Amino acid sequence: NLRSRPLARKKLSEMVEEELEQMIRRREFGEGEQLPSERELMAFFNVGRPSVREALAALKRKGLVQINNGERARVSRPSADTIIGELSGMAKDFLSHPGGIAHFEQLRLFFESSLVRYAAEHATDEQIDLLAKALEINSQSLDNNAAFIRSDVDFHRVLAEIPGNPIFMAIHVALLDWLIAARPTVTDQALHEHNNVSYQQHIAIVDAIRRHDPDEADRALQSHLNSV
Amino acid sequence: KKLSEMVEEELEQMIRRREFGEGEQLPSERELMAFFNVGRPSVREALAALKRKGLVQINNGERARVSRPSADTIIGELSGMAKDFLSHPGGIAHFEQLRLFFESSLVRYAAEHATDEQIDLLAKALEINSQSLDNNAAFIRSDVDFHRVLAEIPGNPIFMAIHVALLDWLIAARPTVTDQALHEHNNVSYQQHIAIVDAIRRHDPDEADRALQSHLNSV
DNA sequence: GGTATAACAGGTATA
DNA sequence: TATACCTGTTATACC
């Protein structure tokens, strides 16, 4: 450890991991694979090989580096996706106990209402083409299977991408994944009429956005979320 | 892929299914490894990940246990997230903007189902909120209590958790606080809350949203 | 004596 | 072709 300090009983792995943390915080490395390999650091610190592996693995969990296969660690910063990855541990309890299912629906409804209100209020002359091509590519009836579902979720994503906030897209993807993960026994009984109703509601929504009237858009969105 | 994450999620869902309660009820990890056809460092990495999460307790050579409280992981995630500040100077305001997208989803709900049982509660809350006198201690406590009783109107435990999380996040983020400017800030805040509760009584969510937007713009 | 923690080499998919 | 991930082995201090 370049300082002659064993620290065996007090877990010497903490010493090397905090030394690596300090060396990274000292702005002595770049943003990629500037850090050496495992054997180089092992020989430089006169320690074991599995210790450095555990250190890096713990560091990745803490959200500091990233490794894939046959490449050194790439130092980065913990973004919004890292927080969502570290979370979701208690999400199973919510779907386990009877409640919470309506709470997630209410949260999603509030989020979508807020974002559609912001989009209708800050409606520029360029984002109209995005929603136009979205409703155009989601207008034809060619595949009544899962293609319409992915088209609808892509339309929702491009609608949520209007503000331009990295945390917004992250939480949107997280909520959509947590919602589609709790859809058991999906059957194709009345999904075609559901697709037609969704198309009509999207047409009404874009018409209300063009006319600058969030009331009708909010009513159509509430009706769509109540019809499920 | 990586075996580690597989057995990690397996033991996570096992401890979530309430298969083992308090104490050292887990079997020997050697025969677990022999049955799962995994490696020794994988189990050590899984235990280290669980210790970093804050669910098990390993000191010397004893076995792991369960952890019912969840306050350690909260401050852990707080310290881990409150770091991305020097990268984006104004992007933090985006996070503040997120708070907007939350509060605008609250003042427009009082006119939905609140009839009289919540009106008395918010009135008796704002009574003490206005009776408060201290600028740094009483006014901040009154403001957070008003925000809590506002978030508790729909009756949702997730909303309260999100609100307190945003509160502690902004508290850890903002490093400098004022006293003279905060006085007029909370003054205008409760002056606008008066109009907010007036519009709530009159069943007009537009005026409440406008007052909230003006309060957020006043900073 | 059981416990975790320590060290080493060897075979193989992959960029 | 060079890389790291996974699997093989044994030695040692403490309760």
B4 touches B46 (CB < 8 A): yes
Copy the structure tokens of residue A73. 């660690």
How far CA A218 is from CA of A117, A171, A183, B153, B203, in Å, comes to 8, 21, 25, 21, 18
Longest distance between any two alpha carbons in chain A, whole Å:
74
Subset of residues 3-62 in chain A with CB less than 7 angstroms from any atom in strand C: 11-13, 47-51
Query: Nearest Cβ partner of A167 from B77, B83, B98?
Result: B98
Residue B157 beta carbon within 7 A of nucleic strand C? no
Is A54 within 8 Å of B48 when comparing Cβ atoms? yes
Residue A71 beta carbon within 7 A of nucleic strand D? yes
> Cα angle vertex B11, ends A8, B33, to 5°?
65
Q: Name the nucleotide nearest B47; use CA and C1'.
A: C4
**Is B45 within 8 Å of chain A by CB?**
yes
User: For the domain that residue B82 is a member of, what is the CATH number?
Assistant: 1.20.120.530
What gap in Å lies between CA B100 and CA A218, rounded to an integer? 18
**Is B157 within 8 Å of chain A by CB?**
yes
What gap in Å lies between CA A180 and CA A164, rounded to an integer? 24
Which residues of B fall within a CB distance of 8 Å from A117?
104
What gap in Å lies between CA A15 and CA A77, rounded to an integer? 22
What gap in Å lies between CA B9 and CA B21, rounded to an integer? 18
HEC letters along B5-61:
HHHHHHHHHHHHCCCCCCCCCCCCHHHHHHHHCCCHHHHHHHHHHHHHHCCCCCCCC
**Is B213 within 8 Å of chain A by CB?**
no
**Is B168 within 8 Å of chain A by CB?**
no
Residue B29 beta carbon within 7 A of nucleic strand C? yes
What gap in Å lies between CA A73 and CA A57, rounded to an integer? 10
As to burial, measured by CB atoms within 10 angstroms (0-12 exposed, 13-18 middle, 19+ buried), residue A144 is exposed
Which residues of A fall within a CB distance of 8 Å from B83?
77-78
Residues found in chain A: 228
Interaxial angle between packed helices B71-81 and B157-173, expressed in degrees from 0 to 180 and rounded to the nearest 10: 40
Is B41 within 8 Å of A58 when comparing Cβ atoms? no
How far CA B23 is from CA of A167, B27, B56, B60, B139, in Å, comes to 40, 12, 11, 16, 45
Which chain A residue shows the shortest CA-CA distance from B78? Answer: A83
What gap in Å lies between CA A141 and CA A192, rounded to an integer? 10
The whole-number Å distance from B62's CA to D15's C1' is 10
Query: Nearest Cβ partner of B81 from A78, A165, A166?
Result: A78
Query: Which H or E run includes A111?
Result: helix A101-121
Compute the half-sphere exposure of residue B24: CA atoms within 13 Å on the CB side of its CA: 8
Which chain B residue shows the shortest CA-CA distance from A103? Answer: B156
CA distance B52 to chain A (A): 8
Which chain B residue shows the shortest CA-CA distance from A104? Answer: B158
Interface of B with A in 86-105 (CB under 8 A): 87, 94-95, 97-98, 100-102, 104-105
Residue B169 DSSP code: H
**Which alpha helices (DSSP H) does chain B contain, by range?**
3-16, 29-36, 40-53, 71-81, 91-103, 110-113, 117-131, 138-151, 157-173, 180-201, 205-218
This structure was determined by cryo-EM
Which of B81, B153, B163 has the highest number of chain A CBs within 10 A, making it the mutation to test binding with A? Answer: B81
Residue A188 DSSP code: -
**Is B207 within 8 Å of chain A by CB?**
no
A76 touches A64 (CB < 8 A): yes
Enclosing domain of residue B163: 77-218
What gap in Å lies between CA A168 and CA A158, rounded to an integer? 12
Residues found in chain B: 219
